[PDB]
Amino acid sequence: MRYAETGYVLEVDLTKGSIERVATDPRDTELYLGGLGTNAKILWDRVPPEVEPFSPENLLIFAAGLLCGTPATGCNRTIVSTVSPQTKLMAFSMMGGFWAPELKYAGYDKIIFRGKSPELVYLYINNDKVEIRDASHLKGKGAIETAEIIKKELNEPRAQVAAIGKAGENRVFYASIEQGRSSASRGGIGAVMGDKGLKAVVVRGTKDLCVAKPEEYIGLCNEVLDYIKHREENPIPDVMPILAGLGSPQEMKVHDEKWHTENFNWGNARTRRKDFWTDEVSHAWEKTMDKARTRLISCYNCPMKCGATISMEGLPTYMMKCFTKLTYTMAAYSDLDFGLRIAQKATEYGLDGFSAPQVMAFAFELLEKGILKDSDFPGLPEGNEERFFYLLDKIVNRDGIGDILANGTYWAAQEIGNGAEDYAHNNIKKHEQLPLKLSMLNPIYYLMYCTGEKINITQIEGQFPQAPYPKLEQREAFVEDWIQVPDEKFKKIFLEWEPRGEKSMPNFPTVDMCCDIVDWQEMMHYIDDALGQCAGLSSFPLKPPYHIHNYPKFIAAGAGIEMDTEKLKKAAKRYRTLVRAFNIRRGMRRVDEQPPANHWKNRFPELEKELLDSYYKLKGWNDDGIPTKETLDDLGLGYVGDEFIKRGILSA
Amino acid sequence: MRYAETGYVLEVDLTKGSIERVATDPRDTELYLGGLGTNAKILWDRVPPEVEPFSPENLLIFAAGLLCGTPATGCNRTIVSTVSPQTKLMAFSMMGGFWAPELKYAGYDKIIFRGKSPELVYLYINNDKVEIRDASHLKGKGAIETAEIIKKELNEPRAQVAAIGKAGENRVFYASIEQGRSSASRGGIGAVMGDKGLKAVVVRGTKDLCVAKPEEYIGLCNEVLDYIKHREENPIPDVMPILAGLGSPQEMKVHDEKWHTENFNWGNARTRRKDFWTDEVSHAWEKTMDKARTRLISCYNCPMKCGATISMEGLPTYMMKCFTKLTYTMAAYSDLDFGLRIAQKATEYGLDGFSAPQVMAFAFELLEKGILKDSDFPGLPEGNEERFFYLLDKIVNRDGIGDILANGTYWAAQEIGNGAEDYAHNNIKKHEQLPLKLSMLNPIYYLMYCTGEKINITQIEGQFPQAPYPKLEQREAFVEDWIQVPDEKFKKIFLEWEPRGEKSMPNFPTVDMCCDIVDWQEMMHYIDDALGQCAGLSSFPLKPPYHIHNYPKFIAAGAGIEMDTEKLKKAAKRYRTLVRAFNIRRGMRRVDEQPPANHWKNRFPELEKELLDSYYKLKGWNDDGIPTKETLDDLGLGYVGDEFIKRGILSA
Amino acid sequence: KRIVKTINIDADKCNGCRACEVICSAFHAMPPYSSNNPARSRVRVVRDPLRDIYVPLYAGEYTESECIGRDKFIIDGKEYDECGFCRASCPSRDLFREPDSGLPLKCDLCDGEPEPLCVKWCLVGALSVTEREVEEPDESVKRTEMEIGLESLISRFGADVVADTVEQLT
Amino acid sequence: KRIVKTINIDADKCNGCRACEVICSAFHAMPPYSSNNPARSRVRVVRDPLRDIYVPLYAGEYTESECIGRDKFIIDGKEYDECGFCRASCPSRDLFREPDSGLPLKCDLCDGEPEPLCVKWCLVGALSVTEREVEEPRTEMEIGLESLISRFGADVVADTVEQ
């Protein structure tokens, strides 16, 4: 029998209105683990490159991670996968909360949506009872609001609901999918969901979820918990609070917003304010936050409570985590109050909190320079904040200029012309990045920005420290108990790393070192995104309770398959290179793998080229960024190579 | 069988430590109703005038009103009776809340305490189980605090507890007895309770309480409720809020403190501030009150919620009603904040909120003039408020000057000398009055101040309006539905009464009219204090749901005795004149029945004498204020007259 | 579709006057309104003004056994009583059980009367009772009050003691 | 005197994570930890973040009948749910009942364990069980019968006893 996973998925054709449960192949589990991996396997041989993002042939997949529904702390992530309407590449997006485990309790590992429903509908799941309900009465409603209405209707207060807002219905290229305190944010998967006419997915599950080796698994869980306790009693020394503990960036818990408001770039990732964090600003923000933060809350089976309920006066309560707290503020040169207020609207609408404020700031820059006229903004108010609310509504409705901006900064700039492309200066592969423009080049982050398939810097970094310690004793004390490292060398590297001197950046660490680091970090992220484990307890923070040493034990005792460290490494490499191959098949080359021109003030071309080359070589790819026939054969991906040669992507 | 009342009482000898249940005489019920009346009957032939207030022979009585424990709305009062250590006369004091009905549910109508316990003890009652517990571990504890500790000890969370604070233990002449949101305040009964070594009385009752004619009684109750609703939907027109509705003075509910802070006398009933109520003061007081008022709460079986829980920062929560909110403030020339804060201390200590701040203000006046020296105040702080806290503690401990002040303004002034008597200018029969010094003489209030046995102006006034209407139409509209009046004449009087002109005060109403009015109001108060009914639904407000017309129906259907309007009037007259006789036997004469010299600015001796004479004549008394042998014979009080002649109080 | 009824208790309006106890016990006297005794009321107010607690608790169904664990809550800064939210006629407290017999008490919403009397007597409006229809089939083993008390006394004293004691009274 | 266990529940500390449900169902599963199913947990967390409601509810006793009327509280601004605080395995809802068969479920504080699993897996510290001693428990019978007679009639009682 199958363990940890359920062994079944749901095939849903929205056009024909057909629902079918299909058993999965355990070999696929042994090869690609699950979640993101098996998602990629599905997309590979069911979505050819001729398929458009808004075509019925495109697939929208909701995947519940392998170990979701097991006693494993924090393992609760949902992985949504499709073809992004913005990047035209593969889009996978992670959402936390309670949905994925609910799906596992319903007895399913994935839901695969194809075709398009002509009428707005939603999917109701309750164990073995699955049906498509009409949702025409929910048109335009917010995501959370929709969830509540549906739960009232179906009389299922304990049902988990993933929904889109109005922006999802109007196919905004950065429309999200919302569920409680959790969001599938980037990529534009919300746009795909809306395009298929799917308003929401409602799941209620009450079946059991078995594991292979009980006592061993729960022992591993207990070990994780104990390590969490110890890790909370001992944060990373001499490091700013938000980079010292476990979980997602604790932006909701009180900290020093000095480093944030003086390193992040305000406006359209433009202005840097070196002395913004005055006492007045600090007290005002602290006051607003104390008034607005109702409670710190957690995802399923986790004690970190990274999330928070936000209640602004005169507004419905919503939930928030991480940097969504800052972006809307920073992009508008406003205060925390404004940010919190507009984030409510944006969250109900279903918008990526990264791209949307950058888009609005971009538009206002275009108005400033003269590329866009006042005529392009019918009834534009005088006040700044008011202008942002106005533009927000214009975008989610695709009204006038909003219709263009809804396509993202890239496709907007290409349609507006007159030098609008110059102002879309924060994109990579047509995807907006963190409003962060550093000074001195960072090799590791160069590689990560360039190659990361998520096209988001925060969802690939983690296991290796962002900065070195000034003194050596600190480094020694830190590497002392650093048990998460795959090889001992990673300690030595961090021992040699210095802030200044000949052992500093960008010349140190060496190219090969940086390649190793990026490989490791990315690997941990891919493992997390396959197992359904929250990055907050693994790939993202320093010294996590989940690492490359105990993970194989978890997969073994949980799923009941053979697994060791090397097999796991090779698996991660396998479906990572598979995602890579998928992106290659849709036209991506080395050309597209470049950071924004102004991303750094200090660039070093001969170092960058060597970095990229060495990394390609380490991944087992071409000089053009394409996986070689050999490495594909080795990773059991022969069919991929055969197709590559057959399509003329590789020479025979 | 007996109805409404239980028919039994508890005789407790604290010296011998003896407890005994004794049946009562139903004739006593038919003659003196109950509560205050039967209390007076007990004191009369068990406490001769040679008995000192702090002697073992003195009695301390806890009486539960006749209709207490019945479905009658608001009927829940306890009447405590003894010989006052301050006035040397009879002291009866009323407390609301939940104690009296609990006693009735325990199966008792009274508790009679005689003798003195050498060790500090308390009385535990639980239906038929009655015992004396040691209370040496409760020495010095506050009243409420004591209640809570005891309830924890005995494991009776639903037990009602009446207790004294430290002031009661140290025999302060204005020490009170506290129970939740309710206080037996004036008289010094707390001092008597402490003097007998009784720390508290704890009662838990779970037996039934029967009435004679069920459906009729509950019908009367329903009538009362309906009238309460109507009365709340229609307040007295063109009258300031606090004088328009039912219940005790709604000082806890938001109103206009303009009339209060500009009519009451600040300090030691001295300073009058005509323009104190500025906008700043009003907003500050409103703010403090909004912050401190936790909830409006009720006594047993009443919807008026006159009480309020008060929670000041850093202080235990306590409860407050009526004018205790103002006194402590006004006496100190401070703010509402200070008042609320010190009232907590005072309440826990067990102090009459009327006399205590007047005493402290008095003392400070003596210090001001020079009669008292700084030497008399060891370590007197500089700040005013601090001085009041200091003096409070000095008084409740009877420490130094505190030992003298603890005896009240009269006995203090008599002991200090050097013209200290001149500053005790607000006493009547050695009992401090409301800090109210009007200008033009008021005949009605002259009589009431002079003759009222409670020696408190607020506990005798009520049924007749304090002021006349300017226009006549208002008077007509008011007398239209005035059904509570015994005789129609009371309407006509109020119709002729005017603010200015020949039909105004003090010449109008006429002497006989005023006598009738005072007689009526006092009668209603005595009825209330016999039945156990709260004055808030009867004698105190205008147009109450309990009046002289329906009360006999209540007594009939409830207690199962014959009763009509005239019989009830005569009963009230009976035990009122009985209380009068008791006071006469302890030395009181016409001499003692005078208001403070400076009580009015405009005095009219020839009118005052005529008033007092006519009132004496109407009550059926001498020109010296003594009930005549004839009227005593008529009221079935022949034994009283016989004793009066035998003692040489009356001539044969 | 059957009908369910709901006792809408707004504990924020409550003033802790216990009128509900009075009128309930009154109406449940035998004959009606004859006596009066909150201890036999089917509605008991959890009152503690010091903690600002005023929670009308309505008698629920009957359980012969105590829980192996009793819950004591802390919610919104308030420290509530052990079992301080339980409606059950339980052998652990004197609530919802006759003081003289320990007989199960149970609220029938004044079955027969025009309106609930506790609701009628709460003048401030802290109580109300509403109805709604449900498609969920009624699956209650609808047992009569007399049968419940009978089985309670039978379980407490014996299946034969009750027979012999009843026989010696009739 | 016997001993009683007080399960202290700090709703002011619970963060809604539902880990209690997980570990409880996990342990109370057959064989131990062979599965987990929140619907089989003796503790169920009343959760609504929009209302700021986070309240762990433990399993009490079984009742074969629903109340005649259901209670729906409103306290300190929070509009709680119908039968929101009830611990009963009552047939008016799926709570504390087997999701398959329907059978009732009761918490036994993990009879035979050092520390209750729901408490150990609550790293935030919102659940604490305590123990104390209280004094352990014929006229009442007679008075009760005399009470039933006066309400339902003597013949009715006599007939009910013999059936």
Ligand SMILES: Nc1nc2c(c(=O)[nH]1)N[C@H]1C(S)=C(S)[C@@H](COP(=O)(O)O)O[C@H]1N2
């Ligand atoms: N497996 C996995 N877990 C993850 C992440 C991820 O990228 N992969 N992102 C983290 C980050 S950066 C954030 S801000 C939170 C947000 O969770 P949400 O998608 O439910 O809003 O998820 C965290 N957990």
Ligand SMILES: Nc1nc2c(c(=O)[nH]1)N[C@H]1C(S)=C(S)[C@@H](COP(=O)(O)O)O[C@H]1N2
């Ligand atoms: N609407 C919305 N957008 C959001 C977020 C969010 O919480 N809500 N999280 C931001 C953060 S901090 C991260 S790490 C990513 C999450 O990426 P995802 O799409 O994989 O969940 O999106 C960003 N955009």
Ligand SMILES: Nc1nc2c(c(=O)[nH]1)N[C@H]1C(S)=C(S)[C@@H](COP(=O)(O)O)O[C@H]1N2
């Ligand atoms: N029956 C009756 N009710 C009465 C009174 C009284 O003397 N008799 N005093 C009233 C006044 S003047 C006040 S200030 C409050 C105080 O109530 P308490 O005795 O419970 O403190 O009770 C009011 N209700």
Ligand SMILES: Nc1nc2c(c(=O)[nH]1)N[C@H]1C(S)=C(S)[C@@H](COP(=O)(O)O)O[C@H]1N2
């Ligand atoms: N300790 C204390 N003293 C108090 C009060 C009180 O509530 N508590 N009430 C005041 C009011 S408004 C009145 S009318 C009388 C009540 O006195 P009595 O009820 O003992 O007759 O005293 C005053 N002194």
Ligand code: SF4
């Ligand atoms: S680690 Fe933080 S973000 Fe991740 S599931 Fe737990 S509480 Fe949620």
Ligand code: SF4
């Ligand atoms: S009317 Fe006011 S003072 Fe009188 S019993 Fe009711 S709550 Fe108490």
Ligand code: SF4
């Ligand atoms: S009183 Fe209520 S909570 Fe306590 S054991 Fe009985 S049924 Fe359970």
Ligand code: SF4
């Ligand atoms: S509705 Fe009737 S039976 Fe129920 S508590 Fe109220 S008065 Fe008693």
Ligand code: SF4
């Ligand atoms: S009648 Fe209403 S306001 Fe009064 S105690 Fe009962 S529930 Fe509270």
Ligand code: SF4
């Ligand atoms: S484990 Fe703790 S935070 Fe989580 S649901 Fe239980 S009590 Fe609440």
Ligand code: SF4
């Ligand atoms: S769940 Fe509890 S409160 Fe609700 S009807 Fe059933 S027994 Fe009564």
Ligand code: SF4
């Ligand atoms: S105390 Fe034990 S039986 Fe009860 S809910 Fe927790 S783990 Fe389950």
Ligand SMILES: [Mg+2]
């Ligand atoms: Mg996300």
Ligand SMILES: [Mg+2]
């Ligand atoms: Mg009083």
Ligand SMILES: [W+6]
């Ligand atoms: W993030």
Ligand SMILES: [W+6]
């Ligand atoms: W008063």
